[PDB]
Amino acid sequence: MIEKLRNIAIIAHVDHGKTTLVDKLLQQSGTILAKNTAIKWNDYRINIVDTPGHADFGGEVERVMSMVDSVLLVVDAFDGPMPQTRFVTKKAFAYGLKPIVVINKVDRPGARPDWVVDQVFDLFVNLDATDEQLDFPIVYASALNGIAGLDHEDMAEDMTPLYQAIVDHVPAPDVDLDGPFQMQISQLDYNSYVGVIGIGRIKRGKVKPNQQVTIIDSEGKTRNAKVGKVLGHLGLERIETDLAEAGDIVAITGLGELNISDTVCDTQNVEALPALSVDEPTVSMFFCVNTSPFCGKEGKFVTSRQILDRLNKELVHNVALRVEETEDADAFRVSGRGELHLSVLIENMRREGFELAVSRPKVIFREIDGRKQEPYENVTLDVEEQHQGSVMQALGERKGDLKNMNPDGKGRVRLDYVIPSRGLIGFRSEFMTMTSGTGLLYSTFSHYDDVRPGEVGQRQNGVLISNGQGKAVAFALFGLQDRGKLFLGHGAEVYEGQIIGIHSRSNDLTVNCLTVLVPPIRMTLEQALEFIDDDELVEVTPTSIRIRKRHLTENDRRRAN
């Protein structure tokens, strides 16, 4: 007995009314979303733990997933599944969890449930076991009428089908009621009256107010403490209990400054629960102090220390990230999840008043069983049919393996690829122009595997490199556009070694733009990071983005050969 417990996490796009759904489940029971919603339906206790927004790689998602035994994916009957819920879903599958899928707003005009079922099932090649895609239940919902059913055209008179699906398909928590107390802190909270609050799912035993405990951290260091209050969850609120047991998701109040991954134990049996979120980076990138003639002329913060400090500050609220020191004490090896991750770190360092230069992002190879290996991704593209042949060939050049293609029937088409990150880096910029801006691209890390032999097509064109420092005059630029496209027009301030344009041919050319014009190519940070080669950097300031050679003088470059 006492396993009428169901702990489930809920996933939804922010516009797909997960708040409205839970609210309906709440008011038809015997009981921004609360972080936990405790529902009493029949003799069952259903904990619905919320998931963070689509942008939150602090490890919060896998903290939630470590407390629940299933997941509830809510999907609009017209929009279908949204790309933003991709990563939360991939992590639920990573924790072995099976999904319950709810297709709500099934009564809205233009609803197409059969269609979104296929989408949800197809989105489900986030490499999910047949256990997770075969036999996931589908429950259609209309929050307006508060009705659910296994068939949208044959719905029940209330939400009973959704309750039953949860009871039937969510397993009871894998816990022991009889052992000594053991609970890992998965979430933290705070209140001015009660202090630091530790939230988790009790793995073993039971806890009472004033119970003597021992907290062991991730390392093995311990301290004794006394439980203040034991807050069980009821509805959207918390309330003091005299007793919480194994399987319960509760909050404990008097243990001091708890940390995530701390394990609260009975003093007689101190045993730490294993930590979780090993989310390793797959793409590295050099963050360097700006050593250019414009150093510290647009950015306030430029020394090596404010760099190393700010980087070692994103570490607390980002764990996919790594930061290393290099032999060069003016450069740092920053590694993140994808190329997009490191971009936003820079893009809002720019807004902090930071001035720095960065290298082209490369993949992190990893040796496994004597075999060198690289990361692969699952890529899904949506292009107009007039771009299909062009997009395909490009991905083939970038070591892409076509796994599926599926036409809209209305002009567009979806393509599915397995591709190494090595070949997908910088593709986004090319793709968007190549597709004339219509195309959509979404990537998801798949697995490491043996490296595909060969290289990705290098930049075909060389660059135009400024030979001196000063303001660019139009009399020179008109002569330079005879040899390629420029990055700047009249009177732009320029120094030596700065890349000022794209050569119409393959070799680099050192020219003079200091000695009536086509609009200059202006590049976003994303475009600039795609452009540069291995002997180049992207100079980044709060208000500017310049591209420069690693070696500024033409003599230094030629010497490197």
Numbering used by the authors: 1 to 31, 56 to 539, 556 to 601
From the reporting publication:
Full-length protein of E. coli BipA crystallizes in the P21 space group with two copies in the asymmetric unit, but is monomeric in solution under physiologically relevant salt concentrations as demonstrated by gel filtration (data not shown). The structure was solved and refined to a resolution of 2.6 Å as described under “Experimental Procedures”. The x-ray crystal structure of the apo form of BipA consists of two superdomains. The N-terminal superdomain comprises domains I and II, and the C-terminal superdomain comprises domains III and V and the unique C-terminal domain. In BipA, these superdomains adopt a distinctive relative orientation to each other that has not been observed in any structure of the homologs EF-G or LepA. The unique C-terminal domain of BipA (residues 483–607) spatially occupies a position between domains III and V and consists of a unique mixed α + β fold composed of eight β-sheets and two α-helices. A long, polar region (residues 540–555) that extends from the distal end of the C-terminal domain is disordered in the crystal structure. We obtained crystals of full-length BipA only in the presence of [Co(NH3)6]3+, two of which can be localized within the structure. One cation is in the center of a crystal contact at the surface of domain I, whereas the other lies in the loop that connects domain V and the C-terminal domain. Apo BipA has a Guinier Rg of 31.06 Å and a real-space Rg of 33.18 Å with a maximum dimension (Dmax) of 108 Å.
